[PDB]
């Protein structure tokens with residue numbers, strides 16, 4: 001993938017969370033996520049996909065991933081998806097928006113889903 | 125997983141798209157997505173995660189998945205993530221919200237991301 | 249406004265909430281909202297804007313409005329915005345997505361905002 | 373309103389857009405918006421609402437507003453809603469997420485709505 005080497009590695013967001021990812025040649029993202037906030041401790045499995053053949057016109061590389069917030073320690077009965085783009089270079093970034101859905105009853109489903117935004121960098 | 129059997133199989137949304145998924149015992153979702161709309165043809169790889177040990181209080185099962193819109197036919201330089209919950213029973217559903225990010229220049233990144241909602245059923 | 253007469257009046261969503269609105273000739277929306285769910289009772293002031301000169305090509309009419317969830321009875325320290333389009337005709341609809349933000353501390357601001365979707369009709 | 377004086381005035385976001393607002397004693401927001409990007413020129417009317425009696429526990433003040441992108445110069449057949457919170461003090465901010473809906477045909481309504489996030493400050 002064009003940005004396989006750029007994406008692969010450890011990333012940090014503005015909350016102090018850690019995103020460890022391997023980008024595969026056929027568009028796969030695999031790794032682990034550790035949130036600094038919320039009903040979470042230690043690492044969670046993540047999986048996702050990226051554009052392995054992005055535009056050559058200076059555009060970012062589209063990607064997304066999912067974490068279900070269950071591991072051996074805790075289960076928050078919730079999943080987050082991040083959708084965004086990798087922007088390579090000296091100060092590389094992944095700029096994302098996310099959707100965090102919890103399991104609800106039907107009566108409470110209107111209130112099932114948080115939205116927010118995370119910016120990941122290779123330092124901090 | 126509690127809902128492994130319920131989630132696994134073929135799903136259809138209100139647009140006429142087809143979602144084919146296998147739920148794994150350790151929380152994995154793998155399969156293929158075919159959109160009835162947009163800059164897409166044929167099937168795309170998807171991966172994601174679900175809560176394999178949901179609450180037993182009548183709540184839904186939280187899940188999410190990603191599709192990067194590149195296959196052997198087309199590349200839309202974009203990725204969609206779906207975040208939502210599975211609601212089992214006679215008229216099973218997956219109720220989702222989604223984020224579709226395209227690769228953009230920095231100047232156009234404000235306009236990188238669509239949001240919407242899909243409801244999947246086992247018929248239609 | 250082209251759709252002034254179509255928008256003006258009483259609307260109901262899938263939750264059983266009631267949206268009472270007057271569309272003005274210069275693009276204003278004014279009225280009251282009563283939620284069937286959440287930390288809400290009775291009516292709340294709403295204000296917003298619509299496109300008073302929409303495209304004549306069969307497109308919908310873009311609009312949005314805000315409710316801050318404070319009235320004489322309760323204060324939920326939160327605001328919802330609805331963004332969507334009016335689609336006129338025998339089975340008129342307003343199709344919306346919404347953002348509901350509560351006041352939070354800085355440490356909890358990641359979790360400040362719910363997202364969802366409401367469909368309003370002139371019956372039910 | 374507790375934060376009437378803090379909110380009232382001129383605000384700037386990270387795109388270079390300008391938000392001019394008056395906060396009323398009964399929760400109203402009125403003013404004008406000028407976007408630095410997109411299909412927009414000069415000022416547009418905005419209206420919205422804020423929590424005029426926020427929590428006294430260090431939480432932000434919830435608010436939202438709408439702009440329909442029609443003025444005497446241009447009509448983008450679209451509306452944006454911002455939902456967020458005011459955080460007062462030496463480096464006051466309004467932290468928002470937004471939904472921008474354009475009028476579409478029914479076939480294209482899946483793609484009607486952009487999502488993003490704006491941070492407003494009293495300088496820049």
Ligand SMILES: O=C(CCCC[C@@H]1SC[C@@H]2NC(=O)N[C@@H]21)NCCN(Cc1ccccn1)Cc1ccccn1
Pocket residue numbers: 013015017034035036037038039040069076078080098100101102111112113114116118356358359
């Ligand atoms: O806490 C979790 C798991 C960890 C999420 C951390 C997120 S992922 C996005 C962001 N980026 C990060 O690095 N960390 C955070 N899920 C429960 C979320 N709950 C609310 C919540 C709110 C405040 C504090 C703790 N929890 C319950 C709930 C879900 C849905 C709707 C309404 N309510």
Ligand SMILES: O=C(CCCC[C@@H]1SC[C@@H]2NC(=O)N[C@@H]21)NCCN(Cc1ccccn1)Cc1ccccn1
Pocket residue numbers: 137139141158159160161162163164193200202204222224225226235236237238240242480482483
């Ligand atoms: O079309 C695609 C790939 C297929 C997406 C189909 C979606 S996924 C969610 C929904 N559920 C489905 O089953 N199908 C659809 N990506 C380009 C999206 N573009 C816009 C678009 C708008 C209208 C028609 C076609 N394309 C460019 C663009 C992306 C971001 C921001 C702004 N603009």
Ligand SMILES: O=C(CCCC[C@@H]1SC[C@@H]2NC(=O)N[C@@H]21)NCCN(Cc1ccccn1)Cc1ccccn1
Pocket residue numbers: 108110111261263265282283284285286287288317324326328346348349350359360361362364366
């Ligand atoms: O309840 C309210 C006011 C009424 C909102 C009703 C909404 S508006 C959209 C939808 N359409 C309708 O007709 N009714 C509903 N605000 C507090 C929301 N809270 C959560 C909540 C969740 C479940 C039940 C009650 N409250 C606290 C909170 C806000 C943000 C983030 C995280 N958490």
Ligand SMILES: O=C(CCCC[C@@H]1SC[C@@H]2NC(=O)N[C@@H]21)NCCN(Cc1ccccn1)Cc1ccccn1
Pocket residue numbers: 232234235385387389406407408409410411412441448450452470472473474483484485486488490
């Ligand atoms: O451009 C406008 C009006 C101005 C919006 C400026 C926004 S408001 C949020 C953000 N904050 C700001 O200060 N400025 C920006 N509406 C058309 C948006 N269009 C896309 C667009 C994309 C790139 C460049 C210009 N336009 C068409 C369209 C709407 C919906 C879905 C899919 N596509």
